[PDB]
Write a protein that binds this ligand. Sequence first.
Ligand code: MB2
Ligand code: ZN
Length: 257
Amino acid sequence: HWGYGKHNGPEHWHKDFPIAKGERQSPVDIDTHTAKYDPSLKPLSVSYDQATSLRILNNGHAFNVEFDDSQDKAVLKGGPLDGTYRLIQFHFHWGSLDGQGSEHTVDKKKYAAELHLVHWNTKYGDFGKAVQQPDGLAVLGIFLKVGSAKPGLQKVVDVLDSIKTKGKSADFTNFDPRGLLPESLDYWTYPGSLTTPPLLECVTWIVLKEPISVSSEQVLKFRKLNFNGEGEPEELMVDNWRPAQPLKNRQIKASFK
Ligand SMILES: NS(=O)(=O)c1ccc(NC(=O)NS(=O)(=O)c2ccc(F)cc2)cn1
Ligand SMILES: [Zn+2]
């Protein structure tokens, strides 16, 4: 039932998913002047050299590039995290216009899109288990702005015509997620949630300060995807972002001065 339309959008989600009004919901606005530098935060460790991408799927709300997470092949460690978190998938949220699309905002600024690299804590054995734990997931969030093309994104962009509609998938092997990362790993971090239903409060959010640049042509191809299934009326997959939620009793920490 849920989606991003007028009658099933983020303002409606709480009826099926009451945790939508919970104490640690995501995304949030990152007020850069109120975030506090935490000198004890360790450097982030992104170890994606052995990543095994498998498939790309249009799930009716975004597209997921899925990875083999049956071994420690692509892992996130360090930063605020205790232990090892395995990459399971990445996806994006984006707008109908370049002035919106990101879920997190920075001093109320919206970016054109936001990349989420989703990882689960290996002490919980699998993803299903992990989402039931307050420290189950670590999502690495990366802002996208429109400017120069991101060469490492192009392989993703070019397969999207083959997964135009909900439920379509395509082989997507040998994709290197390192090509989607910015130069700096400076980040903000806070405890939060999944930003789509079931909105579970299981995520340590790590949001990078440096956005990546993608071209207008690249983002325009995102906007050609469909929310609908094949043979249903076309509704463009755009504005698949949840707006900022109340920070409540949380402090955002910065890894950098
Ligand atoms: N936007 S986000 O916070 O990175 C994010 C990542 C993942 C999800 N949801 C998700 O994976 N849902 S799911 O695949 O159907 C699923 C699978 C297993 C579960 F136990 C619970 C949910 C929602 N949001
Ligand atoms: Zn997401």
